[PDB]
Subunit: 112 residues, 4 copies
């Protein structure tokens, strides 16, 4: 797995389960084209987005539907979603992690 | 101001100065329209983006140009930028502070909304 | 002030008001000695903890009573408190801002140090 | 494993390796007594601190030597260490995660 996403809930201290995640890659006309998508597991993880074959150098956007997550819990959150945008410069594994709260989120990249 | 942006640097323990910020508003033809832009001050703050009159209900995107910030300090960070997307003023006028704390491979954002 | 503390609430999108804060200084008999304490204001800030004269070089511990904060809002959080321990003024006098962003099972802290 | 610690480096986007971690449990005279310790692995993880037998209800302190980590990298950091203090109320697995930067850290508890 060259690309994994992991989502945590900072309020309840749990994985954030069943969170929709959409991945886009930048096209040569500077528009976003769908690339991969999924829902986080019981462990708050999403694997199997891509193969190494398909995950070439490029600019990618990882969109996490945080709003639906919080609304399902009876909480009116601040953000519409959380978006993580990065170049994969693949030269010399990417884990995109997000930690969520209703009015706040943090994200880090672990690249190994 | 009804909309303020504050940016801190987690590596240097400092305000993040001269960070470019672009604000867009969703135009319901569903494209992002330019709304306001500016650069953070020596205190890492950006005020004067808009007036209460102009800051109507809508979905807004605050784009913080983190990459140009780290690169200007001569290094190569992970993210292209940090974006914060939210609905504003949908239960009437509020004051919004969008805060960001930056590291080369990580950032945090939070909103302070007062009435 | 040479030492200020600011606390935000990530669940409510608000300053964290009336949070108790205790500051201690290591006494080199190696016990923590009381230094200053206070409660955050309606803006989530705490000033007036010390003077430049009294804030000498040393190792300081800033203890933020997060548990009493969440419990006062009627819930049961994970941490007992959030502590921030640092050496101060060891390359001469600086101004320190200790900031914390709080959730029931998580917190973040950062320092802004200016000259 | 009832207690795991995981440490990440927010600057470099990597696990924080070889970081010393000391765990204390509160004694009945309101003093801290050593409980468990270790160094993070190549994956930035520390397991095998405790058994379920030994990990009874109590107040625990997890101390992460962040200062040595940053100094070894040629960076003068702000904090002496990062301390995480919590009651384990074990009634109905604890993962203590920390994300580090020279002047900042975040910590979250994932309790499953
Ligand atoms: O902001 C983050 O994505 C973050 C992520 C963290 C993790 C650490 C370790 C693991 Cl396995 C997963 C996650 Cl989401 C810890 C703290 C954080 O602030
Ligand atoms: O996540 C943030 O953007 C953040 C923002 C913080 C602030 C607190 C107070 C002020 Cl005035 C400004 C900022 Cl950026 C403190 C900690 C944080 O983690």
């Amino acid at each position: 797995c060259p690309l994994m996403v992991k989502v945590l809930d900072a309020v309840r201290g749990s994985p954030a389960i069943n969170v929709a995640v959409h991945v886009f890659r930048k096209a040569a006309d500077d528009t976003w084209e769908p690339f991969a998508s999924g829902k986080t597991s019981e462990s708050g993880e999403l694997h199997g987005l891509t193969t190494e074959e398909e995950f070439v150098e490029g600019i990618y956007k990882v969109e996490i539907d945080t709003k639906s997550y919080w609304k399902a819990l009876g909480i009116s959150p601040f953000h519409e979603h959380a978006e993580v945008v990065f170049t994969a410069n693949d030269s010399g594994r990417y884990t995109i992690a997000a930690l969520l709260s209703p009015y706040s989120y943090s994200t880090t990249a672990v690249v190994t």
